[PDB]
Amino acid sequence: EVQLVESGGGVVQPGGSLKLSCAASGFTFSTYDMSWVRQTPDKRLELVATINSNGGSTYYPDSVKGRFTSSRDNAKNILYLQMSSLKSEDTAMYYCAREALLRPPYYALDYWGQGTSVTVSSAKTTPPSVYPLAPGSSVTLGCLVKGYFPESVTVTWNSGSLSSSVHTFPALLQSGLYTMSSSVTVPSSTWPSQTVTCSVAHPASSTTVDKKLE
């Protein structure tokens, strides 16, 4: 099976550097041209680098040219992207993708990796504040999760038990930090009678809050 596995993403400050790597297997890597494509938070796609089979020729759009360098290791079968002078607008999911061999030739990306996340920001890791949302035959409850960085909270209700009537609202960036919320709906007969808890986890700050609704 063809596999492409990207790594080397992270969170950096404006002006910082990263080196992405994409390990390839299950095909003759040195035969194929390879690309890096990014997906920004607005869900738009942009080709950021292409390199030929042998590694001697590259192309970059003007958005990244002079800041990003692609290279490849045709022994161990690895594609690289050295990123420097990073800017907040470089925040994106970065994918490695293989260029199809077509005759006549078209640029077409036939295999893509899972991507690696890059965030460029002046923020530091910051734990969320977590606030319960309670009313004071069905009842809706929630948790407001406010002011955290980077954008990577998970919220579950009674440890995944309540699953099917949960809504998780996508995080918003405001003032350099993220905010999200989550709701659950349960029968009025089960609350306050049986306990409802929202468990909020934010790995970067080592924060787990199991908040009981009252």
Next chain:
Amino acid sequence: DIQMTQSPASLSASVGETVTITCGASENIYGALTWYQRKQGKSPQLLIYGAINLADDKSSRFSGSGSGRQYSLKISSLHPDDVATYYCQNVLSTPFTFGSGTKLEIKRADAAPTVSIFPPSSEQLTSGGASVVCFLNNFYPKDINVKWKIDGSERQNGVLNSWTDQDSKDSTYSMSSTLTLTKDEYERHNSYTCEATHKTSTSPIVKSFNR
């Protein structure tokens, strides 16, 4: 450079329905046009290359057409698992611009939102802040408006909204709206309302509390 645009931005269709979406280029691109499919949470996948050629192992329910500036992706009979964002790419000459995508979603019956309002929590208030939250849950179709009032006058300042993607089990949409204020200003007014305007009623659905 060549600019691309996709229409519509989002389309709802029934399972079994023939669907067509379109991509337009700023100049003739001579069939040098790729389509990708990106399912929620997953990497893009190649669907069509050279405007009309189906990628290996994709279903033949997909087809491409066009030439010149205008291109179409057709799905002969929509399946549930075709919900995705579809992107076109110009590959005539660099930069190889992507269109901004078309989201394909599923049709279902109309539903009015379930609206719930929440005062600031004691925990927040012990901190000096005051966030009032409104959820507008399980509605269809996706278009909706929310308006906050403080003692009957509209407030726009310090309102933030978030919208879910279509629910994978019931096909509804939901929205969360938060009005943030200082504890000091929250204390200057008694009545807090969120009003939801949606196609299912000519009147708004209005939920309220008094501090």
